Amino acid sequence: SGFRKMAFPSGKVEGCMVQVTCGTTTLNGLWLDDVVYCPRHVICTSEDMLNPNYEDLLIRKSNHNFLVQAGNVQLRVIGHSMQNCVLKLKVDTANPKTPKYKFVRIQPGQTFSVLACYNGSPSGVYQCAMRPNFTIKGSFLNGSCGSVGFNIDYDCVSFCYMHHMELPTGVHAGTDLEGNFYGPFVDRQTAQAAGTDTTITVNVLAWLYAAVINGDRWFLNRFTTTLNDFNLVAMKYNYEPLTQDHVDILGPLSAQTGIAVLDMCASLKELLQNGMNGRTILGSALLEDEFTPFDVVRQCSGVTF
Amino acid sequence: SGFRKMAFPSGKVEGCMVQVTCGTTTLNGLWLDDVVYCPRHVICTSEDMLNPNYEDLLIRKSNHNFLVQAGNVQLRVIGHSMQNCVLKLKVDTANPKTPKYKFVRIQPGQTFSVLACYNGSPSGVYQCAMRPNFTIKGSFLNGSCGSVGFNIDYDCVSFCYMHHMELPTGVHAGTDLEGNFYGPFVDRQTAQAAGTDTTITVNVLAWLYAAVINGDRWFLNRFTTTLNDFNLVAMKYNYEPLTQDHVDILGPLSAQTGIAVLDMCASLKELLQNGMNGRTILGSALLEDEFTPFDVVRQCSGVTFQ
Numbered sequence: 001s002g003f004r005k006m007a008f009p010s011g012k013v014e015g016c017m018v019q020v021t022c023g024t025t026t027l028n029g030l031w032l033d034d035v036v037y038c039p040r041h042v043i044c045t046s047e048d049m050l051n052p053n054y055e056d057l058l059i060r061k062s063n064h065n066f067l068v069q070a071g072n073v074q075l076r077v078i079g080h081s082m083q084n085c086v087l088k089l090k091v092d093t094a095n096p097k098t099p100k101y102k103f104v105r106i107q108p109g110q111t112f113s114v115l116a117c118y119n120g121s122p123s124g125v126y127q128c129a130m131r132p133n134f135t136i137k138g139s140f141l142n143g144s145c146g147s148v149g150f151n152i153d154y155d156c157v158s159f160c161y162m163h164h165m166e167l168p169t170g171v172h173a174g175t176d177l178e179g180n181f182y183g184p185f186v187d188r189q190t191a192q193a194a195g196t197d198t199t200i201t202v203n204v205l206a207w208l209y210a211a212v213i214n215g216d217r218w219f220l221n222r223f224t225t226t227l228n229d230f231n232l233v234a235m236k237y238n239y240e241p242l243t244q245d246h247v248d249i250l251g252p253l254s255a256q257t258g259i260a261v262l263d264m265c266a267s268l269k270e271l272l273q274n275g276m277n278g279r280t281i282l283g284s285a286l287l288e289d290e291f292t293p294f295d296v297v298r299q300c301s302g303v304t305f
Numbered sequence: 306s307g308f309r310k311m312a313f314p315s316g317k318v319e320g321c322m323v324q325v326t327c328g329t330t331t332l333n334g335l336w337l338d339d340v341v342y343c344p345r346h347v348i349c350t351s352e353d354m355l356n357p358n359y360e361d362l363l364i365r366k367s368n369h370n371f372l373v374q375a376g377n378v379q380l381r382v383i384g385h386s387m388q389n390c391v392l393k394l395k396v397d398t399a400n401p402k403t404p405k406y407k408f409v410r411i412q413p414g415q416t417f418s419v420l421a422c423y424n425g426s427p428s429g430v431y432q433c434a435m436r437p438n439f440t441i442k443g444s445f446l447n448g449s450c451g452s453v454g455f456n457i458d459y460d461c462v463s464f465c466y467m468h469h470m471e472l473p474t475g476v477h478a479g480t481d482l483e484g485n486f487y488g489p490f491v492d493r494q495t496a497q498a499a500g501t502d503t504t505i506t507v508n509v510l511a512w513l514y515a516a517v518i519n520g521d522r523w524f525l526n527r528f529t530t531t532l533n534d535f536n537l538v539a540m541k542y543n544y545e546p547l548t549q550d551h552v553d554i555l556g557p558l559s560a561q562t563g564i565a566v567l568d569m570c571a572s573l574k575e576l577l578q579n580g581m582n583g584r585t586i587l588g589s590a591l592l593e594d595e596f597t598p599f600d601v602v603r604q605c606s607g608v609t610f611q
């Protein structure tokens with residue numbers, strides 16, 4: 001038993017991280033097959049960053065302006081091009097450690113593991129969710145750009161995030177691996193702000209089920225509610241709407257625990273209205289919203305990769 | 306910016322995990338060079354587990370009674386020995402993925418990454434602390450024995466924990482990689498219970514420093530305390546004593562933030578008395594005690610957001 005914020009094992013991704021240097025800038029790249037992916041802002045000076053014309057900046061660069069190192073081994077760049085906000089550096093060697101992989105664009109509420117890297121060297125791993133406002137609450141310092149987020153299924157790595165910048169409130173923004181930003185952000189040093197965030201309701205419900213599975217039951221009650229009535233409550237507390245699809249996805253946990261989703265919604269309503277009265281749930285005094293239903297089932301059933 | 310429970314990248318350890326089978330029992334082992342390390346309880350059946358005589362159980366085994374599988378490949382066992390509560394199986398292949406490594410026994414309050422594994426395959430990675438009562442609060446199911454805990458400061462893997470069992474209260478117990486249990490526990494299914502746990506004071510202070518580094522000062526106050534008066538108060542909330550060693554090791558964080566250690570102690574006293582009044586610190590409504598001073602320096606900026 002026990003329930004922890006758990007990341008995927010990162011080894012398959014570690015073997016893909018490289019150092020990319022362009023002029024005075026060093027950041028991280030992802031080496032898959034014979035391409036290295038990194039943020040296109042790698043080509044910008046501080047002045048350029050204020051209002052970049054990426055096409056024009058890139059025309060002045062040769063392949064030899066991009067220095068790529070995989071550990072202690074230099075990779076030779078043989079082509080360069082952009083896709084959206086990602087730079088693709090074609091190299092002369094396919095990564096022998098390329099895992100089975102896909103590029104996947106995730107939706108708000110979905111979780112993933114982040115491999116924080118500096119100077120092409122993996123430094124740490126942690127779990128994140130894509131927030132409703134399309135930021136992530138990561139942990140990143142100067143030099144972390146090009147760090148990636150991913151999930152694993154069996155042997156297949158699904159890459160979903162590449163890190164581009166930190167916003168003024170200290171949360172993080174980035175792209176999918178095709179260079180499309182999550183959220184209304186641009187790769188320019190200009191005033192930008194996260195929208196007001198909301199809580200991921202389906203994930204809070206999943207975590208309440210995790211708590212029950214782990215023996216924490218004090219918040220259960222005799223009551224139930226309807227989807228419509230509960231959604232009035234969610235709106236009041238800045239929670240995301242709960243959909244029928246969310247209810248459906250939680251069906252296994254409902255069956256396992258004997259607590260219907262709308263019964264657990266009655267528990268959640270009471271927590272929102274009354275607080276925890278000095279108690280905790282799975283060691284938290286807050287309602288945790290960065291475990292998905294799948295995360296709960298995975299961790300409670302010992303799935304491996 | 307940000308502050309997360311941050312594990313070490315697990316790849317160097319993933320390449321060392323194997324499955325060990327003896328009779329009907331299968332669990333995880335750690336393959337380093339030409340040795341596989343695993344809990345000695347692998348040689349017990351359910352009928353043996355209450356009062357095992359490990360010497361007597363082991364003498365009845367041959368090398369070929371141990372099956373070791375590394376992915377799809379069977380390794381051949383060519384020797385075995387018991388060291389404390391760990392079994393060491395000598396195999397006829399050195400692991401080509403052996404990282405630079407060492408074995409370290411840690412003290413209560415120290416943190417490490419756990420790679421939870423089943424059938425020699427990794428499931429996930431998370432951070433744990435060695436609690437004052439010599440347990441860890443992990444996430445482990447049936448089949449997780451022989452999963453390990455480690456740090457990877459500076460490219461070398463320091464292995465510090467091997468998982469042996471879950472105790473009745475749902476917390477976890479295990480050994481160092483020399484097979485010595487943390488705490489008073491034994492590898493027998495007899496009644497044993499962890500002592501009452503306490504909060505790791507030095508770690509809470511480190512985390513308050515992290516909060517200041519990351520730009521928040523709301524919980525500070527104008528007061529100070531002596532070390533002795535701090536300890537007299539904090540013990541009333543089931544906090545561990547703060548020693549002069551702890552004060553010394555908080556020195557770098559104190560210097561970076563301009564907040565004397567005993568002034569941060571006065572802040573903590575007031576938080577214990579008042580609670581948060583609806584605020585949070587680094588995304589938590591409780592005082593977090595599973596980040597060490599070293600962990601904070603590892604993860605936070607060297608420049609305070611003033």
Ligand SMILES: CCNC(=O)[C@H]1CCN(C(=O)c2cncc(Cl)c2)CCN1Cc1ccc(Br)cc1CC
Nearest residue numbers: 045046049140141142143144165166187188189306
């Ligand atoms: C030389 C020109 N490049 C830059 O200026 C880089 C420098 C590196 N950075 C980091 O390494 C870092 C990452 N995570 C967290 C922290 Cl604290 C720092 C920050 C990102 N900026 C670009 C930038 C900055 C603000 C905004 Br708004 C948008 C953009 C464009 C997407």
Ligand SMILES: CCNC(=O)[C@H]1CCN(C(=O)c2cncc(Cl)c2)CCN1Cc1ccc(Br)cc1CC
Nearest residue numbers: 001350351445446447448449450470471492493494
């Ligand atoms: C067949 C004989 N071996 C056993 O019974 C094994 C079964 C495997 N186990 C697990 O895989 C597991 C690990 N973590 C968490 C969970 Cl929930 C289970 C639990 C450990 N026990 C031994 C045991 C059990 C209680 C105590 Br007290 C001491 C000891 C001796 C160290």
Ligand SMILES: [Cl-]
Nearest residue numbers: 222223224225
């Ligand atoms: Cl009702």
